[PDB]
């Protein structure tokens, strides 16, 4: 499928309602999407853009996002194929200036090279769309939140500069084209369940019971980042901060793995 790149702009605010069809009851949105998130644009219809995050697709107002392209230079000669697979369309010298139109196409960017359109290997271009390093998406997610240490706590925010506990998680996995829902309790009910804290890995999310007088309730979430530490947007300082996993005095509800 041919797709373009969307960056949410939500003019004048931080959120836009999402719907599951192009003719919705505007009062019955399935959830929201947020400022500076990234999506694949599937198409347009009835004033809405059809967007996709990983395995999730929904509809948002065309005014809430902007279609964008990404220029970069190549660092490794390779062939621009007609689809993300090594019919040849052209060739890219040493470091040619190109323009990316789509990403994460089974290892292949979709680009424009001096007027020629097609798919090129990800590692051939200087720009790396995940931004961070890591052995798997879990470690990448962990390194993404580490970049946010010190960011201030604000309710209902998901970046780029302020966060609440659940927004930090959804922001991090949106940067990896992996969708999770917005609230802590829903996040803790999806992805692969890790029943054993000794088996946790960076990028795994942890939900917690933080109210002793409502001990089954789930309002708070963090992400394991290795070495017995997790990171969370916390009201204990109103900041994104490290937290010692073992001495944290609030019980775990679930450990969930959204990376594969």
Residue numbers in the entry: 13 to 98, 101 to 274
Copied sentences from the primary study:
We report that T. vaginalis has acquired, by lateral gene transfer from bacteria, genes encoding peptidoglycan hydrolases of the NlpC/P60 family. NlpC_A1 and NlpC_A2 consist of the C-terminal NlpC/P60 domain preceded by two bacterial SH3 domains. Hence, we concluded that NlpC_A1 and NlpC_A2 are dl-endopeptidases with specificity for the tetrapeptides in peptidoglycan and with greater activity toward monomeric muropeptides.
As expected, due to the high sequence identity and similarity (90.2% and 96.4%, respectively), the two structures are essentially identical, with a root mean square deviation (RMSD) value for all atoms of 0.491 Å (1,379 equivalent atoms). A single-residue difference in NlpC_A2 is located near the active site where Leu169 in NlpC_A1 corresponds to Trp169 in NlpC_A2. The remaining sequence differences, spread across the protein surface, show no obvious cluster of residues that might influence function. The groove is open and lacks the obvious regulatory elements that are often present in bacterial endogenous peptidases, suggesting that both NlpC_A1 and NlpC_A2 may be unregulated “toxin-like” hydrolases of bacterial PG. The theoretical scattering from the structural models with SAXS curves was consistent with the arrangement of domains present in the crystal, suggesting that the NlpC domain and SH3b domains pack in a concerted arrangement in solution.
